[PDB]
Design a protein around this ligand. Structure first.
Ligand SMILES: *[C@@H]1O[C@H](CO)[C@@H](O)[C@H](O)[C@H]1NC(C)=O
Lengths: 72, 265
């Protein structure tokens, strides 16, 4: 029973879209973490979906279209 | 703006929800409590999503407010935000804004994030964003814009995200994106666009994601040549509403064939 957003089983008023870690996106009122290879952004969302090719910027390397941990 | 003598919260902020908000923010015991200007000066962050706020009258007394999360309320007037010069994040999504005062953002020159989505904006004033030289994200999703003023984004040279989906856009002004060389994310889906200006995307050299779906693209030649050739040359940039790479997501009206499938003689 949640009136606003859910992070796991917790009812929360906001997700970590613009601040807080891990950064999150929203799907059907669920807070979900951005892929860990997306670099947290200051001034914009960090992801628009779950995948490593939906980040605004990559935290380490990029193997287009994917952000990746290790040098391609 | 400054209060000179201690004043009840309820009197500074006449909206019952917003007075409750200030009270919780300052951890007071009731909206009848009097507050000082130094207490109001302490407010850096207001977060009151879905709080039934109908007016933010009184917020002009918060000179240091920097983050303003007001999504999902009932605002139709934002005149009292005009001189909150330390604002960096202003979220007004999901309110009842039908229009914006001319020059309402002109003093908010530190704004980075300006979200105006899910309102009922019928138009944008000429030059409404011109002073927001540091803006990095602008969202206008789910409004009722049918056109944009020429050059409305030209001063937003640092813009990284621009969301224009779910409007009623009939056309894009020539050159409208020409200054957005840092733009990475552009939503244009679910509008009434039958064409774009030739070359409209050609300065968007940082663009990584674009949404073009659910527009009635006129795929007759030669008008469709630029958009067809652009998509073919940027087939990994186009995303469908689900968020996946889908260059075929931009469809011709009538036939439903993919725009990028059209070849002009
Ligand atoms: C962004 O940078 C500003 C100024 O340097 C800082 O005060 C703020 O905490 C930062 N953004 C995030 C969410 O880290």
């Amino acid at each position: 029973q949640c009136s606003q957003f859910l992070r796991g089983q917790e009812c929360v008023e906001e997700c970590r879209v613009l601040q807080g870690l891990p950064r999150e996106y929203v799907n059907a009122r669920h807070c979900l973490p951005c892929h860990p290879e997306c670099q947290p952004q200051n001034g914009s969302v960090t992801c628009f979906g779950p995948e490593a090719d939906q980040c605004v910027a990559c935290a380490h390397y990029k193997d287009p279209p994917f952000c990746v941990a290790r040098c391609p | 703006e400054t209060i000179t003598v201690s004043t009840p919260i309820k009197q500074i902020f006449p909206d019952d929800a917003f007075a409750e908000t200030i009270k919780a923010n300052l951890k007071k015991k009731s909206v009848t409590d009097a507050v000082t200007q130094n207490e109001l000066n302490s407010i850096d962050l207001i977060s009151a999503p879905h709080s039934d706020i109908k007016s933010v009258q009184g917020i002009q007394y918060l000179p240091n407010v920097r983050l303003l999360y007001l999504g999902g309320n009932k605002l139709h007037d934002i005149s009292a935000l005009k001189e909150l010069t330390n604002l960096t994040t202003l979220i007004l999504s999901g309110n009842q804004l039908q229009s914006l005062p001319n020059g309402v953002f002109d003093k908010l020159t530190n704004l980075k994030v300006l979200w105006l989505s899910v309102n009922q904006l019928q138009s944008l004033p000429d030059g409404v964003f011109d002073k927001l030289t540091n803006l990095t994200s602008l969202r206008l999703h789910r409004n009722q814009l049918q056109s944009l003023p020429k050059g409305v984004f030209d001063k937003l040279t640092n813009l990284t995200v621009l969301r224009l989906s779910e409007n009623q856009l009939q056309s894009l002004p020539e050159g409208v994106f020409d200054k957005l060389t840092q733009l990475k994310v552009l939503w244009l889906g679910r509008n009434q666009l039958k064409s774009v200006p030739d070359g409209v995307f050609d300065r968007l050299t940082s663009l990584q994601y674009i949404w073009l779906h659910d527009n009635p693209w006129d795929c007759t030649c030669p008008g469709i040549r630029y958009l067809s050739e652009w998509i073919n040359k940027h087939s990994g940039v186009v995303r469908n509403s689900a968020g996946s790479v889908a260059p075929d997501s931009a469809k011709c009206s009538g036939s439903g064939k993919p725009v990028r499938s059209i070849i002009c003689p």
